[PDB]
Structure formats: C-alpha cells, structure tokens
Amino acid sequence: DSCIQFTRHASDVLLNLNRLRSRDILTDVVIVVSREQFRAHKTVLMACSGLFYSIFTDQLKCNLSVINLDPEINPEGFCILLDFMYTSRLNLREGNIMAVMATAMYLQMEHVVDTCRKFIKASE
Amino acid sequence: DSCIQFTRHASDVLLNLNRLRSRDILTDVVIVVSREQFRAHKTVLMACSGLFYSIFTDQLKCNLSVINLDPEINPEGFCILLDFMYTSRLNLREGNIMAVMATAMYLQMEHVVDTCRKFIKASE
Amino acid sequence: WVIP
Amino acid sequence: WVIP
Ligand SMILES: O=C1Cc2cc(Nc3ncnc(Cl)c3Cl)ccc2N1
Ligand SMILES: O=C1Cc2cc(Nc3ncnc(Cl)c3Cl)ccc2N1
Ligand SMILES: [Cl-]
Ligand SMILES: [Cl-]
Numbered sequence: 001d002s003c004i005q006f007t008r009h010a011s012d013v014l015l016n017l018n019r020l021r022s023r024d025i026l027t028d029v030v031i032v033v034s035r036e037q038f039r040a041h042k043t044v045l046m047a048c049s050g051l052f053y054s055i056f057t058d059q060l061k062c063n064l065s066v067i068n069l070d071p072e073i074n075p076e077g078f079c080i081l082l083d084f085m086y087t088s089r090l091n092l093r094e095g096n097i098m099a100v101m102a103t104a105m106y107l108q109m110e111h112v113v114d115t116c117r118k119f120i121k122a123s124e
Numbered sequence: 125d126s127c128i129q130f131t132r133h134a135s136d137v138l139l140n141l142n143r144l145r146s147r148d149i150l151t152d153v154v155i156v157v158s159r160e161q162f163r164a165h166k167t168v169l170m171a172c173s174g175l176f177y178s179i180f181t182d183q184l185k186c187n188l189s190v191i192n193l194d195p196e197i198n199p200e201g202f203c204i205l206l207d208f209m210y211t212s213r214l215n216l217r218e219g220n221i222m223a224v225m226a227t228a229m230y231l232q233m234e235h236v237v238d239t240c241r242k243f244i245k246a247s248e
Numbered sequence: 249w250v251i252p
Numbered sequence: 253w254v255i256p
Contacts, residue, residue: 001215005252006235009212010134016171025181026167043150043165047140057149088133089256091125111130115253129256213252239249 011088017044018086031082032068036075038082048085050108070106077103084112092119135212141168142210155206156192160199162206172209174232194230201227208236216243 020026020041027039042062045052055061069078077099084090090112092100101116144150144165151163166186169176179185193202201223208214214236216224225240 001213002217003213003215003252004239004249005213006208006239006249007212009208009235010138013168013171013209014134014137016177017167020167020170026170026186041167043141043144043167044137046144046150047137053140062150084130084133085137088131089125089127089129090253091127093126111133111253115128115130127256128253130253214249235249 014086014088017041021086028065030066031078032066033073033075033078034071036078038078040082040085044085048107048109050110051106053108073103073106074099081107081109081112084109090115092116094123138210138212141165145210152189154190155202156190157197157199157202158195160202162202164206164209168209172231172233174234175230177232197227197230198223205231205233205236208233214239216240218247 021039021044024039027041029040029042029045031038031040031045042052042056046056047053055067061067076096080091080096080100081103090100092115097116097119101113101120104112104116145163145168148163151165153164153166153169155162155164155169166176166180170180171177179191185191200220204215204220204224205227214224216239221240221243225237225244228236228240
C-alpha cells in the first residue's frame with residue numbers, strides 16, 4: 001500500500017493500556033498465583049503469552065473471570081512478566097532470573113526465555 | 125530502574141491485537157457509523173482516541189455493547205482510522221483526506237489531525 | 249510520521 | 253533487547 005506510519009503509535013497504545021490496568025479500567029480477569037491475585041485484560045495477556053492465547057481461545061475458558069496458575073509458579077516472577085507485557089521493560093536480576101525464566105517458559109513467552117538463557121550462560 | 129527493554133514488544137502486541145480483531149476474538153463493542161458496523165476492543169479504542177476514552181470511562185456507557193457515532197461521520201474515514209489504531213499505518217489519500225481529518229477531529233486523535241493538516245497545507 |  |  002501507500003500508507004504512512006506513526007513510529008510511536010504502538011508504544012503509546014501500550015502505555016495507555018498500562019494506565020487502564022493501573023486504574024483497574026475494563027480489566028476482565030484475575031490471575032491467581034498461589035496467595036496472590038493480579039487483575040489484567042485478557043486481550044493483552046493473549047497478545048503476550050502462548051499459554052494465555054491458548055486459554056482464552058478455548059470456548060469454555062474464554063468466559064472465566066478467574067484463572068488459577070500451576071502452584072509451582074512464583075508470584076514475583078509472574079508480577080515481573082505481567083509488568084513486561086504492559087511496558088516492554090523486564091526487571092531481570094540475579095535474585096529473580098531463575099523464577100522469571102521458569103514463569104516465562106510456563107507462559108510461553110519465547111523472547112523472555114531467550115534473554116534469560118543468555119544472561120544465565122554469561123554467568124557460567 | 126535497571127530493566128532491559130525488548131524493542132519490538134509494543135509492535136508485536138499491536139500486531140496480535142489486530143489478529144484478534146480480524147478473527148473477531150474477545151471484541152466487546154460494535155461501532156455503528158450510519159449503515160456500517162465495526163467490531164472492536166473497547167480498550168484499544170480508548171488507548172487510541174480521546175472520544176472513546178471519555179465514552180468508556182463513563183459509568184453507564186462503559187457497559188454498552190453498541191455505540192452510535194454522529195450521522196455526519198463518514199464510514200470509510202472511520203474504517204481508515206480503526207485500521208490505523210490497530211496497525212500504526214494510515215491510508216491517507218487525496219480522495220479521503222478531508223473525511224479522515226474530520227473523523228480524527230471527532231475521535232480526538234491529535235497526531236492524525238496534525239499529519240492531515242500538514243498534508244493539506246502542502247497542497248495549497 | 250514515516251514511509252514504512 | 254536494549255538498555256532503555
Ligand atoms: O512467545 C510467544 C508470545 C505469543 C503470543 C501469542 N499470541 C497470538 N499469536 C497469534 N495470533 C494471535 Cl491472535 C495472538 Cl493473541 C501466541 C503465541 C506466543 N508465543
Ligand atoms: O489524541 C489522543 C489519543 C488519546 C488517547 C487517550 N487515552 C488515554 N489517555 C490517558 N490515559 C488512558 Cl488510561 C487512556 Cl486509554 C486519551 C486522549 C487521547 N488523545
Ligand atoms: Cl516474550
Ligand atoms: Cl493519533
């Protein structure tokens with residue numbers, strides 16, 4: 001086509017989706033990770049995670065307002081990944097890298113799994 | 125903070141949101157523009173438009189499944205802007221620029237209004 | 249704005 | 253990935 005493109009549009013959209021999440025606006029699901037609860041937009045979770053994409057395209061699970069993750073999932077690792085989904089920024093630290101990588105593998109977030117593998121390899 | 129950032133994350137999210145729109149997945153509103161109907165995600169519309177942001181933060185309108193736009197709004201102009209919301213690409217042409225700019229003013233999409241003004245000024 |  |  002002969003379209004023009006606004007470079008900052010995708011980033012501005014994601015910024016506004018994170019503002020709606022922070023104010024709990026039109027959030028339609030709560031993700032339960034052991035004792036912790038995280039409110040989010042199903043569409044953003046599906047857009048970021050192969051696991052959520054599979055869950056919310058399922059004809060019965062698409063209608064659930066609560067999703068319980070596997071008990072082995074670490075709440076902090078999930079929180080870090082949810083923040084990444086809504087911002088593009090990943091808070092990867094020596095103290096959390098193992099939990100973040102395991103959570104990213106479970107959530108099927110291949111680019112996160114890739115950077116965790118590389119950061120771990122460099123420390124070996 | 126000491127976060128790392130994935131450059132293509134926002135673009136990849138927007139691409140997946142457009143794929144969900146094309147397959148009509150988790151769309152929660154229909155925008156009526158005279159004889160034409162457009163299915164979308166309320167969160168994406170709010171993230172892109174000052175008008176939709178105001179509509180869907182309203183305590184009664186946030187729950188509507190149908191929104192009717194002003195009868196002066198051109199369906200093609202709306203279609204072009206909805207495509208822009210989900211892709212960052214604007215199909216701006218001599219034959220549609222007046223309708224696109226008027227629709228962008230109504231929808232409160234300031235960056236689109238700005239490029240239309242500049243493209244019109246150059247042709248004068 | 250750019251030519252993509 | 254970059255340092256933002
Ligand atoms: O590493 C990742 C990140 C990811 C996201 C999704 N999401 C979607 N993919 C295709 N079309 C659609 Cl409509 C969506 Cl929402 C699926 C798989 C994966 N894997
Ligand atoms: O030209 C534009 C594009 C636009 C989008 C929105 N959206 C939001 N703004 C602030 N916080 C939130 Cl939560 C959202 Cl969703 C509001 C005004 C405008 N004007
Ligand atoms: Cl990822
Ligand atoms: Cl805009």
